[PDB]
CSV table of C-alpha atoms in Angstrom, one decimal:
chain,number,residue,atom,x,y,z
A,1,UNK,CA,-34.6,38.1,-13.0
A,2,UNK,CA,-36.5,35.0,-13.9
A,3,UNK,CA,-34.6,31.8,-13.4
A,4,UNK,CA,-35.3,28.7,-15.7
A,5,UNK,CA,-35.7,24.9,-14.5
A,6,UNK,CA,-32.0,24.7,-14.4
A,7,UNK,CA,-30.4,21.1,-13.2
A,8,UNK,CA,-27.0,20.7,-11.5
A,9,UNK,CA,-24.0,20.9,-13.6
A,10,UNK,CA,-22.0,18.9,-11.1
A,11,UNK,CA,-20.2,22.3,-10.3
A,12,UNK,CA,-19.7,23.7,-6.7
A,13,UNK,CA,-19.0,27.8,-6.6
A,14,UNK,CA,-17.5,29.9,-3.5
A,15,UNK,CA,-16.4,33.0,-3.0
A,16,UNK,CA,-12.4,33.6,-3.2
A,17,UNK,CA,-12.5,35.4,0.6
A,18,UNK,CA,-14.0,31.8,1.7
A,19,UNK,CA,-11.2,29.7,0.4
A,20,UNK,CA,-9.3,29.2,3.6
A,21,UNK,CA,-12.8,28.4,5.3
A,22,UNK,CA,-13.4,25.3,2.5
A,23,UNK,CA,-9.5,24.4,3.0
A,24,UNK,CA,-10.1,24.4,6.8
A,25,UNK,CA,-13.6,22.4,7.1
A,26,UNK,CA,-12.6,20.2,4.5
A,27,UNK,CA,-9.0,19.0,4.9
A,28,UNK,CA,-7.2,20.7,8.0
A,29,UNK,CA,-10.0,19.7,10.5
A,30,UNK,CA,-11.7,17.2,8.7
A,31,UNK,CA,-11.9,13.6,10.6
A,32,UNK,CA,-12.3,10.4,8.6
A,33,UNK,CA,-14.8,9.2,11.2
A,34,UNK,CA,-17.1,11.6,10.3
A,35,UNK,CA,-17.3,10.8,6.4
A,36,UNK,CA,-19.1,7.2,7.1
A,37,UNK,CA,-21.3,6.3,5.3
A,38,UNK,CA,-20.7,9.0,2.8
A,39,UNK,CA,-19.3,8.0,-0.6
A,40,UNK,CA,-15.9,6.9,-0.4
A,41,UNK,CA,-13.6,10.0,-1.7
A,42,UNK,CA,-16.0,12.7,-1.1
A,43,UNK,CA,-13.4,15.2,-0.4
A,44,UNK,CA,-11.7,14.4,-3.6
A,45,UNK,CA,-14.9,14.8,-5.5
A,46,UNK,CA,-16.0,18.3,-4.0
A,47,UNK,CA,-12.5,19.5,-4.5
A,48,UNK,CA,-12.6,18.6,-8.3
A,49,UNK,CA,-16.2,19.8,-8.3
A,50,UNK,CA,-14.6,23.2,-7.2
A,51,UNK,CA,-12.0,23.6,-9.5
A,52,UNK,CA,-14.3,22.6,-12.4
A,53,UNK,CA,-15.9,25.9,-11.5
A,54,UNK,CA,-12.8,27.7,-11.4
A,55,UNK,CA,-12.2,26.8,-14.8
A,56,UNK,CA,-15.6,27.2,-16.0
A,57,UNK,CA,-15.7,30.7,-14.7
A,58,UNK,CA,-12.0,31.1,-16.3
A,59,UNK,CA,-10.6,32.3,-12.7
A,60,UNK,CA,-7.1,31.0,-13.2
A,61,UNK,CA,-6.0,32.4,-9.7
A,62,UNK,CA,-8.8,30.2,-7.9
A,63,UNK,CA,-7.6,27.1,-9.9
A,64,UNK,CA,-4.1,28.1,-8.8
A,65,UNK,CA,-4.7,29.2,-5.3
A,66,UNK,CA,-7.2,26.3,-4.2
A,67,UNK,CA,-5.0,23.4,-5.7
A,68,UNK,CA,-1.7,25.1,-3.9
A,69,UNK,CA,-3.6,25.3,-0.7
A,70,UNK,CA,-5.1,21.8,-0.9
A,71,UNK,CA,-1.6,20.4,-1.3
A,72,UNK,CA,-0.2,22.4,1.8
A,73,UNK,CA,-3.5,21.4,3.8
A,74,UNK,CA,-3.2,17.6,2.9
A,75,UNK,CA,0.9,18.0,3.7
A,76,UNK,CA,0.3,19.9,7.0
A,77,UNK,CA,-2.5,17.3,8.2
A,78,UNK,CA,-0.1,14.5,7.4
A,79,UNK,CA,3.1,15.8,9.3
A,80,UNK,CA,0.5,16.0,12.5
A,81,UNK,CA,-0.8,12.8,11.9
A,82,UNK,CA,2.5,11.0,10.7
A,83,UNK,CA,1.9,7.9,12.8
A,84,UNK,CA,-2.2,7.8,11.7
A,85,UNK,CA,-2.7,4.8,9.5
A,86,UNK,CA,-5.8,5.4,9.1
A,87,UNK,CA,-5.6,9.4,8.5
A,88,UNK,CA,-2.8,8.7,6.2
A,89,UNK,CA,-4.4,6.2,4.4
A,90,UNK,CA,-7.7,8.7,4.0
A,91,UNK,CA,-5.3,11.2,2.1
A,92,UNK,CA,-3.5,9.0,0.1
A,93,UNK,CA,-7.2,7.5,-1.2
A,94,UNK,CA,-8.5,11.1,-1.7
A,95,UNK,CA,-5.3,12.5,-3.2
A,96,UNK,CA,-5.4,9.8,-5.7
A,97,UNK,CA,-9.2,10.1,-6.7
A,98,UNK,CA,-8.6,14.0,-7.0
A,99,UNK,CA,-6.0,13.0,-9.6
A,100,UNK,CA,-7.8,10.6,-11.4
A,101,UNK,CA,-10.5,13.1,-11.7
A,102,UNK,CA,-8.3,15.8,-13.1
A,103,UNK,CA,-6.9,13.0,-15.6
A,104,UNK,CA,-10.4,11.7,-16.5
A,105,UNK,CA,-11.7,14.9,-17.1
A,106,UNK,CA,-8.5,16.6,-18.3
A,107,UNK,CA,-10.0,17.1,-22.0
A,108,UNK,CA,-7.4,15.2,-23.4
A,109,UNK,CA,-8.5,12.4,-25.4
A,110,UNK,CA,-5.8,9.7,-24.0
A,111,UNK,CA,-7.7,9.6,-21.1
A,112,UNK,CA,-11.2,10.1,-22.2
A,113,UNK,CA,-11.4,6.5,-23.6
A,114,UNK,CA,-13.5,4.7,-21.0
A,115,UNK,CA,-15.6,7.9,-20.7
A,116,UNK,CA,-19.4,8.1,-21.5
A,117,UNK,CA,-20.9,11.0,-23.5
A,118,UNK,CA,-22.3,12.7,-20.5
A,119,UNK,CA,-19.1,12.2,-18.6
A,120,UNK,CA,-17.3,14.0,-21.6
A,121,UNK,CA,-19.6,17.3,-20.7
A,122,UNK,CA,-17.9,17.6,-17.3
A,123,UNK,CA,-14.1,18.0,-19.0
A,124,UNK,CA,-12.2,21.3,-18.3
A,125,UNK,CA,-12.5,23.7,-21.0
A,126,UNK,CA,-10.2,26.5,-20.2
A,127,UNK,CA,-7.1,25.4,-18.1
A,128,UNK,CA,-4.3,22.6,-18.7
A,129,UNK,CA,-3.6,21.7,-15.1
A,130,UNK,CA,-0.6,19.1,-16.0
A,131,UNK,CA,1.7,20.8,-13.7
A,132,UNK,CA,-0.8,20.1,-10.9
A,133,UNK,CA,-1.2,17.0,-11.4
A,134,UNK,CA,2.3,16.1,-11.5
A,135,UNK,CA,2.6,17.7,-8.1
A,136,UNK,CA,-0.3,15.7,-7.0
A,137,UNK,CA,1.5,12.5,-8.4
A,138,UNK,CA,4.8,13.2,-6.4
A,139,UNK,CA,2.5,13.8,-3.3
A,140,UNK,CA,0.9,10.3,-3.7
A,141,UNK,CA,4.0,8.6,-3.4
A,142,UNK,CA,5.0,10.4,-0.6
A,143,UNK,CA,1.6,9.7,1.3
A,144,UNK,CA,2.3,6.0,0.5
A,145,UNK,CA,5.8,6.1,1.8
A,146,UNK,CA,4.3,7.5,5.1
A,147,UNK,CA,2.0,4.7,4.9
A,148,UNK,CA,4.3,2.2,4.6
A,149,UNK,CA,6.3,3.5,7.5
A,150,UNK,CA,3.5,3.6,9.9
A,151,UNK,CA,2.4,0.0,9.1
A,152,UNK,CA,5.7,-1.9,9.2
A,153,UNK,CA,6.5,0.1,12.5
A,154,UNK,CA,3.5,-1.6,13.8
A,155,UNK,CA,3.9,-5.0,12.5
A,156,UNK,CA,7.5,-5.1,13.8
A,157,UNK,CA,7.6,-6.0,17.1
A,158,UNK,CA,4.9,-8.8,16.1
A,159,UNK,CA,7.0,-10.6,13.3
A,160,UNK,CA,9.4,-13.0,15.4
A,161,UNK,CA,7.2,-13.8,17.9
A,162,UNK,CA,4.2,-14.6,15.4
A,163,UNK,CA,6.3,-16.4,13.0
A,164,UNK,CA,9.1,-18.4,15.0
A,165,UNK,CA,7.8,-18.0,18.8
A,166,UNK,CA,5.0,-11.8,22.8
A,167,UNK,CA,2.7,-12.4,20.0
A,168,UNK,CA,0.7,-14.8,18.1
A,169,UNK,CA,0.2,-15.2,14.6
A,170,UNK,CA,-3.7,-14.1,15.0
A,171,UNK,CA,-2.3,-11.2,16.3
A,172,UNK,CA,-0.3,-10.7,13.4
A,173,UNK,CA,-3.7,-11.2,11.0
A,174,UNK,CA,-5.6,-9.3,13.3
A,175,UNK,CA,-3.6,-6.4,12.4
A,176,UNK,CA,-3.3,-7.2,8.5
A,177,UNK,CA,-7.0,-7.4,8.6
A,178,UNK,CA,-7.5,-3.9,10.8
A,179,UNK,CA,-5.2,-2.3,7.8
A,180,UNK,CA,-6.8,-3.8,5.0
A,181,UNK,CA,-10.5,-2.7,6.1
A,182,UNK,CA,-9.6,1.0,6.6
A,183,UNK,CA,-8.0,0.9,2.9
A,184,UNK,CA,-11.3,-0.7,1.3
A,185,UNK,CA,-13.8,1.8,3.3
A,186,UNK,CA,-11.9,4.6,2.6
A,187,UNK,CA,-11.9,3.7,-1.2
A,188,UNK,CA,-8.2,3.0,-1.8
A,189,UNK,CA,-7.3,1.5,-5.1
A,190,UNK,CA,-7.2,-2.0,-5.1
A,191,UNK,CA,-4.1,-2.1,-7.1
A,192,UNK,CA,-2.9,0.0,-4.3
A,193,UNK,CA,-4.0,-2.2,-1.9
A,194,UNK,CA,-2.1,-4.9,-3.5
A,195,UNK,CA,1.4,-3.2,-3.4
A,196,UNK,CA,0.8,-2.2,0.1
A,197,UNK,CA,0.5,-6.0,1.3
A,198,UNK,CA,3.2,-7.2,-0.9
A,199,UNK,CA,5.5,-4.7,0.8
A,200,UNK,CA,4.3,-5.6,4.2
A,201,UNK,CA,4.9,-9.5,3.7
A,202,UNK,CA,8.5,-8.8,2.2
A,203,UNK,CA,9.1,-7.2,5.6
A,204,UNK,CA,8.0,-10.3,7.3
A,205,UNK,CA,10.0,-12.5,5.1
A,206,UNK,CA,13.2,-10.5,5.4
A,207,UNK,CA,13.0,-9.9,9.5
A,208,UNK,CA,11.9,-13.7,10.0
A,209,UNK,CA,15.0,-14.9,7.5
A,210,UNK,CA,17.4,-12.7,9.2
A,211,UNK,CA,16.3,-14.3,12.6
A,212,UNK,CA,17.3,-17.7,11.1
A,213,UNK,CA,20.7,-16.5,9.7
A,214,UNK,CA,22.0,-15.1,12.8
A,215,UNK,CA,20.6,-17.7,15.6
A,216,UNK,CA,20.9,-21.5,16.1
A,217,UNK,CA,18.3,-21.4,18.7
A,218,UNK,CA,15.8,-21.2,15.9
A,219,UNK,CA,17.3,-23.5,13.4
A,220,UNK,CA,15.7,-26.9,14.1
A,221,UNK,CA,13.5,-29.2,12.1
A,222,UNK,CA,10.9,-28.4,14.5
A,223,UNK,CA,10.7,-24.5,13.8
A,224,UNK,CA,11.0,-25.3,10.1
A,225,UNK,CA,7.7,-27.3,10.3
A,226,UNK,CA,5.8,-24.7,12.7
A,227,UNK,CA,7.2,-21.9,10.4
A,228,UNK,CA,6.1,-23.4,7.2
A,229,UNK,CA,2.5,-23.7,8.8
A,230,UNK,CA,2.3,-20.3,10.0
A,231,UNK,CA,3.5,-19.1,6.7
A,232,UNK,CA,0.5,-21.4,5.4
A,233,UNK,CA,-1.9,-19.1,7.2
A,234,UNK,CA,-0.6,-16.2,5.9
A,235,UNK,CA,-1.5,-17.5,2.6
A,236,UNK,CA,-4.7,-18.7,3.3
A,237,UNK,CA,-5.5,-15.3,4.8
A,238,UNK,CA,-4.3,-13.8,1.5
A,239,UNK,CA,-6.5,-15.9,-0.6
A,240,UNK,CA,-9.6,-15.0,1.5
A,241,UNK,CA,-8.9,-11.7,0.9
A,242,UNK,CA,-8.5,-11.7,-2.7
A,243,UNK,CA,-4.8,-10.5,-2.1
A,244,UNK,CA,-3.2,-13.3,-3.7
A,245,UNK,CA,-2.5,-11.2,-7.0
A,246,UNK,CA,-0.6,-8.7,-5.0
A,247,UNK,CA,2.9,-10.8,-5.4
A,248,UNK,CA,2.8,-10.7,-1.5
A,249,UNK,CA,3.4,-15.1,-1.6
A,250,UNK,CA,6.2,-14.5,-3.8
A,251,UNK,CA,7.8,-12.3,-1.5
A,252,UNK,CA,8.1,-14.8,1.2
A,253,UNK,CA,10.0,-17.7,-1.5
A,254,UNK,CA,12.9,-17.1,0.6
A,255,UNK,CA,11.5,-18.1,4.0
A,256,UNK,CA,9.4,-20.5,2.6
A,257,UNK,CA,12.5,-22.4,1.4
A,258,UNK,CA,14.5,-21.8,4.4
A,259,UNK,CA,11.6,-23.4,6.5
A,260,UNK,CA,11.9,-26.4,3.9
A,261,UNK,CA,15.4,-26.6,4.2
A,262,UNK,CA,15.2,-26.9,7.9
A,263,UNK,CA,13.2,-30.1,7.3
A,264,UNK,CA,14.8,-31.8,4.8
A,265,UNK,CA,17.7,-34.7,5.2
A,266,UNK,CA,21.0,-33.7,5.4
A,267,UNK,CA,23.4,-36.7,4.9
A,268,UNK,CA,23.9,-38.0,1.4
A,269,UNK,CA,24.8,-36.6,-1.9
A,270,UNK,CA,21.4,-37.1,-2.7
A,271,UNK,CA,20.1,-35.1,0.0
A,272,UNK,CA,22.5,-32.0,-0.7
A,273,UNK,CA,21.5,-32.5,-4.6
A,274,UNK,CA,17.8,-31.8,-3.3
A,275,UNK,CA,18.7,-29.2,-1.0
A,276,UNK,CA,20.4,-27.3,-3.9
A,277,UNK,CA,17.7,-27.9,-6.2
A,278,UNK,CA,15.0,-26.8,-3.8
A,279,UNK,CA,16.8,-23.4,-2.5
A,280,UNK,CA,16.9,-21.6,-5.7
A,281,UNK,CA,15.9,-18.2,-4.0
A,282,UNK,CA,18.4,-18.5,-1.0
A,283,UNK,CA,22.0,-17.8,-1.8
A,284,UNK,CA,25.0,-20.0,-1.7
A,285,UNK,CA,25.8,-18.2,2.1
A,286,UNK,CA,22.3,-18.4,3.3
A,287,UNK,CA,22.1,-22.3,2.7
A,288,UNK,CA,25.5,-22.5,4.1
A,289,UNK,CA,24.8,-20.3,7.3
A,290,UNK,CA,21.4,-22.6,8.0
A,291,UNK,CA,23.3,-25.9,7.6
A,292,UNK,CA,26.0,-24.5,10.1
A,293,UNK,CA,23.2,-23.0,12.6
A,294,UNK,CA,21.4,-26.2,12.4
A,295,UNK,CA,20.6,-27.9,16.1
A,296,UNK,CA,19.0,-31.0,16.5
A,297,UNK,CA,16.4,-30.9,19.6
A,298,UNK,CA,17.7,-34.1,20.8
A,299,UNK,CA,20.7,-35.9,21.5
A,300,UNK,CA,19.3,-38.8,19.3
A,301,UNK,CA,20.2,-36.4,15.9
A,302,UNK,CA,24.0,-34.9,14.7
A,303,UNK,CA,24.7,-31.6,13.5
A,304,UNK,CA,25.4,-31.0,10.0
A,305,UNK,CA,29.1,-32.1,9.2
A,306,UNK,CA,31.7,-30.4,7.6
A,307,UNK,CA,31.7,-33.1,4.6
A,308,UNK,CA,28.2,-32.4,4.0
A,309,UNK,CA,28.3,-28.7,3.9
A,310,UNK,CA,31.7,-28.6,1.5
A,311,UNK,CA,29.4,-30.9,-0.7
A,312,UNK,CA,26.7,-28.2,-0.6
A,313,UNK,CA,29.4,-25.4,-1.6
A,314,UNK,CA,30.9,-27.7,-4.5
A,315,UNK,CA,27.4,-28.2,-5.9
A,316,UNK,CA,26.7,-24.6,-5.7
A,317,UNK,CA,30.0,-23.3,-7.3
A,318,UNK,CA,28.3,-22.2,-10.5
A,319,UNK,CA,26.4,-19.5,-8.3
A,320,UNK,CA,27.5,-15.8,-7.7
A,321,UNK,CA,25.0,-14.9,-5.8
A,322,UNK,CA,24.9,-11.4,-3.7
A,323,UNK,CA,27.5,-11.1,-1.2
A,324,UNK,CA,25.7,-10.3,2.5
A,325,UNK,CA,24.2,-13.1,4.5
A,326,UNK,CA,21.1,-11.0,5.6
A,327,UNK,CA,18.2,-9.3,3.6
A,328,UNK,CA,17.5,-5.6,3.9
A,329,UNK,CA,14.2,-5.5,6.0
A,330,UNK,CA,13.9,-1.8,4.7
A,331,UNK,CA,13.8,-2.4,1.1
A,332,UNK,CA,11.1,-0.8,-1.0
A,333,UNK,CA,9.6,-1.9,-3.7
A,334,UNK,CA,9.1,0.5,-6.7
A,335,UNK,CA,5.4,1.3,-6.9
A,336,UNK,CA,2.9,2.5,-9.8
A,337,UNK,CA,-0.5,3.7,-8.8
A,338,UNK,CA,-2.2,3.4,-12.4
A,339,UNK,CA,-5.4,6.0,-13.8
A,340,UNK,CA,-8.6,4.4,-12.7
A,341,UNK,CA,-11.2,6.1,-14.3
A,342,UNK,CA,-14.6,5.7,-12.6
A,343,UNK,CA,-18.4,5.4,-13.8
A,344,UNK,CA,-19.5,7.8,-11.3
A,345,UNK,CA,-21.4,10.8,-12.4
A,346,UNK,CA,-20.5,14.3,-10.6
A,347,UNK,CA,-24.3,15.5,-10.7
A,348,UNK,CA,-25.2,13.0,-7.9
A,349,UNK,CA,-22.6,14.4,-5.0
A,350,UNK,CA,-24.7,15.1,-2.0
A,351,UNK,CA,-23.0,17.0,0.9
A,352,UNK,CA,-23.4,16.4,4.6
A,353,UNK,CA,-23.9,19.6,6.6
A,354,UNK,CA,-21.3,18.1,9.2
A,355,UNK,CA,-18.9,19.3,6.8
A,356,UNK,CA,-20.3,22.8,7.4
A,357,UNK,CA,-19.8,24.0,3.7
A,358,UNK,CA,-23.2,25.5,3.2
A,359,UNK,CA,-21.5,28.5,1.6
A,360,UNK,CA,-20.6,26.3,-1.4
A,361,UNK,CA,-23.7,26.8,-3.8
A,362,UNK,CA,-24.5,24.7,-6.5
A,363,UNK,CA,-24.1,25.2,-10.2
């Protein structure tokens, strides 16, 4: 019959027999490479547009099957690419954006407060997808855990030589810059980006301090001076990238204090008092260890005396502190990925033919 002049509603329709193909071409076989320079998180937007048509047509089987198959496809891709930072970051970003869409367009007033009138026209009408959002939320946490695992594994061999000693600092920074560039390009939430680097800089803090707590060959005034300089370059890199609100600098306070301790005078009651008031982020045990390990680099200086160490120990009596000497390098900070509604209108999503998704027609 005769058709009206109909404009795009921002929905994408497909036949149920083509779902396996959709999941194949949009998830299973998708390479992040191909998607530059499209809109970032294009798969999340296409996926929501499909879910929205399923809801529009009151098709709860299509809704259930699509979501379930998407979640399974993503887990399959990530198990296959379990050492791939880019691929892992790519699906974190899209899993998050898909979850944001399902919240922002849930139809629940508590999520629709930054929504424009037209955006509200794009809300789901039939289905409450609360259980699927919970699954997507659990999934984003698991993908983030893989991302940290990958990034820490890459950084691990670089740390000791970059901070104390083979790798240079510039190599560490180049790696950090690589990680950051990928996450930005893929549209990962800046709040998640902040939490990633907080985590990685804690690992630098822990691994480097553990080396100072066990090895006399690095506990010298010279190392402390060089270490403090290296940490300052990291801080400058962080500020230059607008990552200084991440909490990353704070995670390095123990190491910073260790580097300064190595440079402080270590002879008098006054010297002892200075060390105690400065080293508020080092336990009594850690401070005493570094003082014991401390080795002058020429015969013109002596080692810290037993008397001095006992003076330190008496000044720190009021402290309980933990117990173990070393820091857990694998400590993971709890995270929160907040709801991040976008000002984007689904009404304007164009789909490249390299995705091979022409069978999806526009409603």
